[PDB]
Ligand binder design. Structure first.
Ligand code: MG
Ligand code: MG
Ligand code: MG
Ligand code: MG
Ligand code: MG
Ligand code: MG
Ligand code: MG
Ligand code: MG
Ligand code: MG
Ligand code: MG
Ligand code: MG
Ligand code: MG
Ligand code: MG
Ligand code: MG
Ligand code: MG
Ligand code: MG
Ligand code: MG
Ligand code: MG
Ligand code: MG
Ligand code: MG
Ligand code: MG
Ligand code: MG
Ligand code: MG
Ligand code: MG
Ligand code: MG
Ligand code: MG
Ligand code: MG
Ligand code: MG
Ligand code: MG
Ligand code: MG
Ligand code: MG
Ligand code: MG
Ligand code: MG
Ligand code: MG
Ligand code: MG
Ligand code: MG
Ligand code: MG
Ligand code: MG
Ligand code: MG
Ligand code: MG
Ligand code: MG
Ligand code: MG
Ligand code: MG
Ligand code: MG
Ligand code: MG
Ligand code: MG
Ligand code: MG
Ligand code: MG
Ligand code: MG
Ligand code: MG
Ligand code: MG
Ligand code: MG
Ligand code: MG
Ligand code: MG
Ligand code: MG
Ligand code: MG
Ligand code: MG
Ligand code: MG
Ligand code: MG
Ligand code: MG
Ligand code: MG
Ligand code: MG
Ligand code: MG
Ligand code: MG
Ligand code: MG
Ligand code: MG
Ligand code: MG
Ligand code: MG
Ligand code: MG
Ligand code: MG
Ligand code: MG
Ligand code: MG
Ligand code: MG
Ligand code: MG
Ligand code: MG
Ligand code: MG
Ligand code: MG
Ligand code: MG
Ligand code: MG
Ligand code: MG
Ligand code: MG
Ligand code: MG
Ligand code: MG
Ligand code: MG
Ligand code: MG
Ligand code: MG
Ligand code: MG
Ligand code: MG
Ligand code: MG
Ligand code: MG
Ligand code: MG
Ligand code: MG
Ligand code: MG
Ligand code: MG
Ligand code: MG
Ligand code: MG
Ligand code: MG
Ligand code: MG
Ligand code: MG
Ligand code: MG
Ligand code: MG
Ligand code: MG
Ligand code: MG
Ligand code: MG
Ligand code: MG
Ligand code: MG
Ligand code: MG
Ligand code: MG
Ligand code: MG
Ligand code: MG
Ligand code: MG
Ligand code: MG
Ligand code: MG
Ligand code: MG
Ligand code: MG
Ligand code: MG
Ligand code: MG
Ligand code: MG
Ligand code: MG
Ligand code: MG
Ligand code: MG
Ligand code: MG
Ligand code: MG
Ligand code: MG
Ligand code: MG
Ligand code: MG
Ligand code: MG
Ligand code: MG
Ligand code: MG
Ligand code: MG
Ligand code: MG
Ligand code: MG
Ligand code: MG
Ligand code: MG
Ligand code: MG
Ligand code: MG
Ligand code: MG
Ligand code: MG
Ligand code: MG
Ligand code: MG
Ligand code: MG
Ligand code: MG
Ligand code: MG
Ligand code: MG
Ligand code: MG
Ligand code: MG
Ligand code: MG
Ligand code: MG
Ligand code: MG
Ligand code: MG
Ligand code: MG
Ligand code: MG
Ligand code: MG
Ligand code: MG
Ligand code: MG
Ligand code: MG
Ligand code: MG
Ligand code: MG
Ligand code: MG
Ligand code: MG
Ligand code: MG
Ligand code: MG
Ligand code: MG
Ligand code: MG
Ligand code: MG
Ligand code: MG
Ligand code: MG
Ligand code: MG
Ligand code: MG
Ligand code: MG
Ligand code: MG
Ligand code: MG
Ligand code: MG
Ligand code: MG
Ligand code: MG
Ligand code: MG
Ligand code: MG
Ligand code: MG
Ligand code: MG
Ligand code: MG
Ligand code: MG
Ligand code: MG
Ligand code: MG
Ligand code: MG
Ligand code: MG
Ligand code: MG
Ligand code: MG
Ligand code: MG
Ligand code: MG
Ligand code: MG
Ligand code: MG
Ligand code: MG
Ligand code: MG
Ligand code: MG
Ligand code: MG
Ligand code: MG
Ligand code: MG
Ligand code: MG
Ligand code: MG
Ligand code: MG
Ligand code: MG
Ligand code: MG
Ligand code: MG
Ligand code: MG
Ligand code: MG
Ligand code: MG
Ligand code: MG
Ligand code: MG
Ligand code: MG
Ligand code: MG
Ligand code: MG
Ligand code: MG
Ligand code: MG
Ligand code: MG
Ligand code: MG
Ligand code: MG
Ligand code: MG
Ligand code: MG
Ligand code: MG
Ligand code: MG
Ligand code: MG
Ligand code: MG
Ligand code: MG
Ligand code: MG
Ligand code: MG
Ligand code: MG
Ligand code: MG
Ligand code: MG
Ligand code: MG
Ligand code: MG
Ligand code: MG
Ligand code: MG
Ligand code: MG
Ligand code: MG
Ligand code: MG
Ligand code: MG
Ligand code: MG
Ligand code: MG
Ligand code: MG
Ligand code: MG
Ligand code: MG
Ligand code: MG
Ligand code: MG
Ligand code: MG
Ligand code: MG
Ligand code: MG
Ligand code: MG
Ligand code: MG
Ligand code: MG
Ligand code: MG
Ligand code: MG
Ligand code: MG
Ligand code: MG
Ligand code: MG
Ligand code: MG
Ligand code: MG
Ligand code: MG
Ligand code: MG
Ligand code: MG
Ligand code: MG
Ligand code: MG
Ligand code: MG
Ligand code: MG
Ligand code: MG
Ligand code: MG
Ligand code: MG
Ligand code: MG
Ligand code: MG
Ligand code: MG
Ligand code: MG
Ligand code: MG
Ligand code: MG
Ligand code: MG
Ligand code: MG
Ligand code: MG
Ligand code: MG
Ligand code: MG
Ligand code: MG
Lengths: 116, 64, 202, 149
RNA sequence: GGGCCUGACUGCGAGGCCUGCAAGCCGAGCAGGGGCGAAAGCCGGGCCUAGUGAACCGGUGGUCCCGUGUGGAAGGGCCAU
RNA sequence: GGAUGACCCCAGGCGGUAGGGGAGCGUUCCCGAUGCCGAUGAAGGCCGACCCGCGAGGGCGGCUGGAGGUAAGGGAAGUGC
RNA sequence: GUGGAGCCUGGGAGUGAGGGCGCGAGCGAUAACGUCCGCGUCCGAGCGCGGGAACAACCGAGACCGCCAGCUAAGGCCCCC
RNA sequence: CUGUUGGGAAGCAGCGCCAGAGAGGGUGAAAGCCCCGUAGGCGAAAGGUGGGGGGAUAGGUGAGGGUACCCGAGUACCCCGUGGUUCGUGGAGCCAUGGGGGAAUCUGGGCGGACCACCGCCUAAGGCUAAGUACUCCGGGUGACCGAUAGCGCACCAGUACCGUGAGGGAAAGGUGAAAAGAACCCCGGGAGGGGAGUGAAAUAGAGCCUGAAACCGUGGGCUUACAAGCAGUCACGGCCCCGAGGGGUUGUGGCGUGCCUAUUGAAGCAUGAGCCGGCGACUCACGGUCGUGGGCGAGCUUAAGCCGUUGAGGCGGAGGCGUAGGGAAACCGAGUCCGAACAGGGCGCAGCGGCCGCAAAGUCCGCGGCCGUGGACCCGAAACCGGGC
RNA sequence: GGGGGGAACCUGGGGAACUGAAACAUCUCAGUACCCAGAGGAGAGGAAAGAGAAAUCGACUCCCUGAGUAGCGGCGAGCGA
């Protein structure tokens, strides 16, 4: 019996096309260009969810560093003092403290100078 | 269509009971005057062909 | 070995038959596979680039036209051209081993036997070629037609009477075969039928 | 047991290998053929059982041996098949060539020769030949060797 | 350098070297009939590593294996070259 | 562990071209089917931020469509751009 | 020394254009992003990731998936960063 | 038949009936019982057939004994040149015959693979001969055959239009609706077209008509954009708009970021290919082989062609094939055999589990899968070669 | 009475090449494609100057098998009773 393409190919193309909603020109309009665009998009997303982990930590650090220098030390010193004091509050949190909770941040700074 | 027996192999070779392939030693067709008797004598025996070469010849003999 | 109900004027007696204890569903499947393959017509066909109606002229020159190279428009790469590896007339049949068919027959009858669904009968009352006659007899014989029946008998008059019933498949005993036994829920046989089947599985 | 229950045993019906159908299959594009060269081409190579790239072949360098025959062909002569004593075990009373053909031991068109693997059994065995030891074992077990001619 | 000699054997060949194949190489030992030596023993060419060419087709000597109804014959196989 | 591929637990492996192997998805057609779904709406089309699945996919809903479609289990190929 | 170790029989391949680098030579001119061998490596197939401004093969390191957590590697810590 | 929903009942419901007929197609949707059919039956004045039945006719039919009349001529036969056969000059016969030579009539002749003998087979040089066999323009039946890029080149006014001096090449192009009820009449317009009215279950079913995807063009709306550097995305945050501790759309800023495929040592590569979209488009089939695998039987396994049956029913058929023994060029011997003087040495061969029962197995058959051989053998592509024509 | 036509099929008279032989000439392709003549619903063949070893069979045709056997073969590729 014969099995002509039929319905099958239009359906794969709509799938891809639908994922390409938003893209510029033929990239949302042409199955071919959409598919190219999507290969790139999936690799970036993978790469970028990796580096979001880095992007944020760099930020926490810039923030911690600012808050430290108001109390007369640098980030590197503050982190060594935390280590020596045995304090394990992470940088995501150290940062929230530095902004939302200056009194607490100050005390951790104190423990950090004291610990050395 | 059915396979054909290769007649050149049928004429040179025999498949033994266990499926080895056997043929005459080469090298005493001629130029024999200065060959020692050890040589002529030993080239008078059959030998068992190396496996890859035998397996090939066997497929040429589908009906032995 | 198996105990099989027999309907009679004297009433429901029992008959002993040695049919296989073991049913081998793979083998049953193999017999049915053979049966259905061999009834195939094999009449699907297509045309090759050589069998298609166009000419063999090279449509345009090999080089310098700015177009792709082609030969004739019969080539399968052209709409209208031949088909690559389409179906051609075919024989789907093959000789399934005789013993398998035999063992298969026997197992199928055996399978219905083990379910109570095999029923042997001496004769068919008043069925003289009329559907309503077979219908009466059937009701009386426990066949309301809620279960499909493979009726096997050499009595032509009985086959005609029953054939039109949607739930009945009829056969002469020389025709007993496993697809029909396996397709139906209940097996009903003449003793004369049962006799030939015993000779065939011997 | 009904039609919906009829199944082949696992492995009885395997899928074919389909090539040139997409990357996920791991057999796309080159269809497992690798890249270029004669073997990848439609039509492929020369008979790999013989051909060796142009050098004289392994087979053709070996010497021919023996009588190959001449027109008008095979010379008609009586052909003998041996069947051992052990194969005669199953019979009782008499064995003749015809019988042995029926039992599926002796092929048609061959004369019978009895051979010595096994024990002899006191039967009357009728045949075109006997090996030395078959004759001995048979005579000794009280069987009766009869020669046909 | 000399004496006697033809083992510059015939039938085989454990086990190895080398090695894609096919080839190439070394070879104790047993048997037959020998050479030299009093004997132990050595001798299956040459101190050694090059001096060579697979198959096909055909020649010659032998063998007496096949011989197209049978006996021969033609022609072939086999051993040697 | 439990007895058996029921699922739980501990550990380890899991970049990949040529290429080997395994397990699946979907298309057309056959048995299943004198059956079953269907105008209270078939196939097909268009939507969906919902459900299941690693995925190929499969559901479910709304709109369009207006007459077909076809399960569990199997079978066969003009089967996936 | 229990390892995607090894050995044996069999089925299926692909490959038989490599390339950079380090070390050892030859060829070249103690030239070439040169050429030709040897041992090793990496790219090839890791054009995935960090460093080297950018950069297949230099340094760091072998990416099963997820995390707005932690420790390091080479390389860095004046601003770009 | 009735009821019911519905434009329509054949759907659903109630109560029935036929069946040698429940194959199938229609009817406003899904019908055994409405129509056409189907099972089972029936039917030719005329023409054709008539291989079957009957009849006729042609034609056919003895035994010794003697005679030695006849028994297919440029023939056999030999030689030369060739063809046919499996036979390619081979030890080359046989059948045929272009050249030369050239008989006999059974006490004749040809043949059994040079030749000779023996032993057999057969009657050349005249002719005819049903059936069993091949094919498919034609008719019918049937599809695990196509379904309008398919299937014939053509579903349609196609071997047409059109192309070519000619031979010759050779398309595209199907579908309103159940029914034309195919939209009277009015309005704008030269008309085309539209707007009402009307028909219809439905009119974005209105004839440029079923469905009506995609590329492509537009109108309307939300978000956004004129100091900005870009393989067009991705991650983050924030603004606005929408649906209602959430989601969706949009995108300002910040981070990261060298298209796809092909071929390559190596490509974003300034190396190939692709304007975009839809559809067509490439590893198959037969037969053999080899391994693997699912079963059946197992010193055995298996049938082919055919025949009987069936009309989607299977059976019979043992001819034959593979296996049961090997070794040897062979004669030949045989669990051995070959080389050899050898009782030497060597090559190649020979030798289930449990409790008489079961179990497994040689092997073999069928199915399935991988790969191989032969075919065009994964698809597309030459320049060329050959035949017959124009 | 002939003449001319008929899709395939059939006999007879003529009769290639690509290709395969991984070059090519013998060989293959193949007595195929194709031209021609003729027949017919078929055509051909057919009643032994046969076969070929059986003391045998008994016209011809056609299918299965014998058998990829016997053989043929730059003893190659292959061909094949
Ligand atoms: Mg397709
Ligand atoms: Mg299609
Ligand atoms: Mg499609
Ligand atoms: Mg697609
Ligand atoms: Mg779609
Ligand atoms: Mg899809
Ligand atoms: Mg966007
Ligand atoms: Mg766009
Ligand atoms: Mg655009
Ligand atoms: Mg668009
Ligand atoms: Mg994607
Ligand atoms: Mg990631
Ligand atoms: Mg990353
Ligand atoms: Mg400071
Ligand atoms: Mg630290
Ligand atoms: Mg810390
Ligand atoms: Mg040969
Ligand atoms: Mg030799
Ligand atoms: Mg030679
Ligand atoms: Mg010689
Ligand atoms: Mg010679
Ligand atoms: Mg020498
Ligand atoms: Mg010597
Ligand atoms: Mg010798
Ligand atoms: Mg055979
Ligand atoms: Mg054998
Ligand atoms: Mg079919
Ligand atoms: Mg078919
Ligand atoms: Mg076709
Ligand atoms: Mg066709
Ligand atoms: Mg063509
Ligand atoms: Mg053509
Ligand atoms: Mg044509
Ligand atoms: Mg054509
Ligand atoms: Mg044409
Ligand atoms: Mg042509
Ligand atoms: Mg042409
Ligand atoms: Mg042409
Ligand atoms: Mg060009
Ligand atoms: Mg162009
Ligand atoms: Mg073109
Ligand atoms: Mg173009
Ligand atoms: Mg062209
Ligand atoms: Mg073409
Ligand atoms: Mg062409
Ligand atoms: Mg064509
Ligand atoms: Mg076509
Ligand atoms: Mg067509
Ligand atoms: Mg095609
Ligand atoms: Mg093809
Ligand atoms: Mg083709
Ligand atoms: Mg095919
Ligand atoms: Mg057919
Ligand atoms: Mg098949
Ligand atoms: Mg068959
Ligand atoms: Mg019925
Ligand atoms: Mg039924
Ligand atoms: Mg299959
Ligand atoms: Mg794939
Ligand atoms: Mg694979
Ligand atoms: Mg791969
Ligand atoms: Mg590709
Ligand atoms: Mg492969
Ligand atoms: Mg391959
Ligand atoms: Mg390739
Ligand atoms: Mg390659
Ligand atoms: Mg390629
Ligand atoms: Mg290459
Ligand atoms: Mg190449
Ligand atoms: Mg290759
Ligand atoms: Mg390729
Ligand atoms: Mg190619
Ligand atoms: Mg080709
Ligand atoms: Mg080729
Ligand atoms: Mg032979
Ligand atoms: Mg006795
Ligand atoms: Mg002396
Ligand atoms: Mg050795
Ligand atoms: Mg060696
Ligand atoms: Mg001595
Ligand atoms: Mg001695
Ligand atoms: Mg002495
Ligand atoms: Mg010695
Ligand atoms: Mg010297
Ligand atoms: Mg020397
Ligand atoms: Mg030498
Ligand atoms: Mg040669
Ligand atoms: Mg040669
Ligand atoms: Mg010779
Ligand atoms: Mg003779
Ligand atoms: Mg003799
Ligand atoms: Mg003779
Ligand atoms: Mg004599
Ligand atoms: Mg003699
Ligand atoms: Mg003599
Ligand atoms: Mg002689
Ligand atoms: Mg001789
Ligand atoms: Mg010799
Ligand atoms: Mg992996
Ligand atoms: Mg696996
Ligand atoms: Mg697989
Ligand atoms: Mg499924
Ligand atoms: Mg699909
Ligand atoms: Mg599937
Ligand atoms: Mg179908
Ligand atoms: Mg049905
Ligand atoms: Mg249906
Ligand atoms: Mg319903
Ligand atoms: Mg309605
Ligand atoms: Mg609806
Ligand atoms: Mg569907
Ligand atoms: Mg469909
Ligand atoms: Mg979906
Ligand atoms: Mg829908
Ligand atoms: Mg319908
Ligand atoms: Mg279905
Ligand atoms: Mg199904
Ligand atoms: Mg089934
Ligand atoms: Mg296809
Ligand atoms: Mg292990
Ligand atoms: Mg490994
Ligand atoms: Mg490994
Ligand atoms: Mg494979
Ligand atoms: Mg290779
Ligand atoms: Mg390669
Ligand atoms: Mg090379
Ligand atoms: Mg190389
Ligand atoms: Mg290179
Ligand atoms: Mg390398
Ligand atoms: Mg190199
Ligand atoms: Mg570099
Ligand atoms: Mg190097
Ligand atoms: Mg260094
Ligand atoms: Mg160096
Ligand atoms: Mg050097
Ligand atoms: Mg300088
Ligand atoms: Mg270099
Ligand atoms: Mg350098
Ligand atoms: Mg250098
Ligand atoms: Mg290297
Ligand atoms: Mg590469
Ligand atoms: Mg790396
Ligand atoms: Mg690596
Ligand atoms: Mg990469
Ligand atoms: Mg890097
Ligand atoms: Mg970097
Ligand atoms: Mg950097
Ligand atoms: Mg890298
Ligand atoms: Mg890993
Ligand atoms: Mg740290
Ligand atoms: Mg460091
Ligand atoms: Mg820096
Ligand atoms: Mg109403
Ligand atoms: Mg009604
Ligand atoms: Mg009702
Ligand atoms: Mg019926
Ligand atoms: Mg019906
Ligand atoms: Mg109907
Ligand atoms: Mg219904
Ligand atoms: Mg229906
Ligand atoms: Mg109806
Ligand atoms: Mg009738
Ligand atoms: Mg009728
Ligand atoms: Mg008389
Ligand atoms: Mg006379
Ligand atoms: Mg006469
Ligand atoms: Mg005359
Ligand atoms: Mg002549
Ligand atoms: Mg000839
Ligand atoms: Mg010859
Ligand atoms: Mg001849
Ligand atoms: Mg003449
Ligand atoms: Mg005479
Ligand atoms: Mg005479
Ligand atoms: Mg004659
Ligand atoms: Mg003659
Ligand atoms: Mg003669
Ligand atoms: Mg004769
Ligand atoms: Mg004769
Ligand atoms: Mg005639
Ligand atoms: Mg007749
Ligand atoms: Mg006839
Ligand atoms: Mg016919
Ligand atoms: Mg027809
Ligand atoms: Mg279809
Ligand atoms: Mg249809
Ligand atoms: Mg169309
Ligand atoms: Mg068409
Ligand atoms: Mg359409
Ligand atoms: Mg037509
Ligand atoms: Mg067309
Ligand atoms: Mg058309
Ligand atoms: Mg027209
Ligand atoms: Mg012109
Ligand atoms: Mg014109
Ligand atoms: Mg033309
Ligand atoms: Mg066209
Ligand atoms: Mg209509
Ligand atoms: Mg209509
Ligand atoms: Mg309607
Ligand atoms: Mg007006
Ligand atoms: Mg108007
Ligand atoms: Mg208007
Ligand atoms: Mg109007
Ligand atoms: Mg109305
Ligand atoms: Mg309605
Ligand atoms: Mg609409
Ligand atoms: Mg409509
Ligand atoms: Mg339109
Ligand atoms: Mg319609
Ligand atoms: Mg429309
Ligand atoms: Mg439209
Ligand atoms: Mg649109
Ligand atoms: Mg707008
Ligand atoms: Mg500025
Ligand atoms: Mg601005
Ligand atoms: Mg961005
Ligand atoms: Mg941020
Ligand atoms: Mg939002
Ligand atoms: Mg946002
Ligand atoms: Mg990067
Ligand atoms: Mg870029
Ligand atoms: Mg790059
Ligand atoms: Mg791509
Ligand atoms: Mg490309
Ligand atoms: Mg290239
Ligand atoms: Mg290049
Ligand atoms: Mg290059
Ligand atoms: Mg670029
Ligand atoms: Mg560019
Ligand atoms: Mg260029
Ligand atoms: Mg480019
Ligand atoms: Mg290029
Ligand atoms: Mg263009
Ligand atoms: Mg576009
Ligand atoms: Mg497309
Ligand atoms: Mg394949
Ligand atoms: Mg196979
Ligand atoms: Mg098998
Ligand atoms: Mg069986
Ligand atoms: Mg055979
Ligand atoms: Mg021995
Ligand atoms: Mg068993
Ligand atoms: Mg078996
Ligand atoms: Mg293979
Ligand atoms: Mg072909
Ligand atoms: Mg092909
Ligand atoms: Mg192939
Ligand atoms: Mg071509
Ligand atoms: Mg030209
Ligand atoms: Mg030429
Ligand atoms: Mg020429
Ligand atoms: Mg011409
Ligand atoms: Mg001409
Ligand atoms: Mg005429
Ligand atoms: Mg005529
Ligand atoms: Mg002719
Ligand atoms: Mg003539
Ligand atoms: Mg001729
Ligand atoms: Mg000519
Ligand atoms: Mg030629
Ligand atoms: Mg060709
Ligand atoms: Mg070839
Ligand atoms: Mg050639
Ligand atoms: Mg060639
Ligand atoms: Mg040339
Ligand atoms: Mg040639
Ligand atoms: Mg050819
Ligand atoms: Mg020929
Ligand atoms: Mg002719
Ligand atoms: Mg023809
Ligand atoms: Mg005529
Ligand atoms: Mg006829
Ligand atoms: Mg006739
Ligand atoms: Mg005639
Ligand atoms: Mg006569
Ligand atoms: Mg045979
Ligand atoms: Mg020929």
């Amino acid at each position: 019996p014969r099995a002509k393409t039929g319905v099958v190919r239009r359906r794969k193309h709509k799938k891809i096309l639908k994922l390409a909603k938003g893209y510029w020109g033929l990239r949302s309009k042409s199955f071919r260009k959409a598919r190219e665009t999507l290969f790139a998009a999936g690799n970036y997303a993978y790469a970028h969810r990796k580096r979001r982990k880095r992007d944020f930590r760099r930020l926490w650090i810039v923030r911690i560093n600012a808050a430290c220098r108001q109390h007369g030390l640098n980030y590197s010193t503050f982190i060594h003092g935390l280590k020596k004091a045995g304090i394990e509050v992470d940088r995501k949190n150290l940062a929230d403290l530095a902004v939302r909770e200056p009194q607490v941040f100050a005390e951790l700074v104190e423990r950090a100078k004291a610990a050395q | 269509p059915k396979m054909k027996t290769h007649k050149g192999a049928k004429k040179r070779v025999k498949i033994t009971a266990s499926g080895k392939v056997v043929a005459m030693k080469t090298g005493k067709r001629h130029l024999n005057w200065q060959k020692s008797g050890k040589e002529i004598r030993q080239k008078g025996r059959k030998f068992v062909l190396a496996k890859p070469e035998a397996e090939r010849i066997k497929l040429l003999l589908p009906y032995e | 070995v198996y105990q099989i109900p027999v309907l009679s004027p004297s009433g429901r007696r029992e008959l002993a038959a040695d049919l296989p204890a073991e049913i081998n569903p793979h083998l049953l499947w193999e017999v049915v596979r053979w049966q259905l393959a061999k009834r195939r017509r094999g009449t699907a066909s297509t045309k090759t680039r050589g069998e298609v109606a166009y000419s063999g002229r090279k449509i345009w020159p090999q080089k310098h036209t700015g177009r792709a190279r082609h030969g004739d428009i019969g080539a399968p790469i052209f709409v209208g051209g031949g088909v690559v590896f389409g179906p051609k007339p075919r024989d789907y049949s093959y000789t399934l081993p005789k013993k398998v068919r035999k063992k298969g027959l026997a197992m199928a009858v055996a399978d219905r036997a083990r379910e109570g669904k095999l029923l042997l009968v001496e004769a068919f009352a008043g069925v003289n070629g009329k559907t309503k006659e077979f219908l009466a007899w059937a009701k009386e014989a426990g066949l309301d037609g809620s279960e499909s029946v493979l009726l096997v008998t050499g009595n032509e008059l009985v086959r005609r009477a029953a054939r039109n019933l949607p739930w009945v498949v009829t056969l002469a005993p020389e025709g007993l075969n496993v697809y029909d036994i396996v397709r139906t829920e209940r097996l009903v046989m003449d003793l004369d039928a049962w006799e030939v089947f015993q000779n065939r599985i011997g | 047991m009904k039609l919906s229950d009829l199944r082949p045993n696992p492995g009885a019906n395997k899928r074919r290998k389909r090539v040139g159908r997409g990357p996920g299959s791991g057999h796309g594009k080159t269809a497992t053929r690798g890249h270029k060269g004669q073997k990848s081409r439609s039509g492929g190579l020369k008979d790999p059982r013989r051909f060796e790239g142009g050098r004289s072949t392994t087979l053709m360098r070996l010497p021919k041996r023996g009588m190959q025959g001449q027109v008008p062909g095979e010379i008609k002569r009586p052909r003998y098949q041996g069947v051992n004593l052990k194969d005669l075990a199953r019979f009782e009373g008499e064995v003749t060539p015809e019988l042995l053909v029926r039992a599926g031991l002796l092929k048609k068109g061959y004369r019978l020769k009895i051979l010595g693997e096994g024990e002899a059994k006191p039967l009357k065995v009728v045949a075109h030949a006997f090996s030395k030891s078959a004759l001995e074992k048979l005579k000794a077990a009280g069987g009766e060797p009869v020669l046909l001619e």
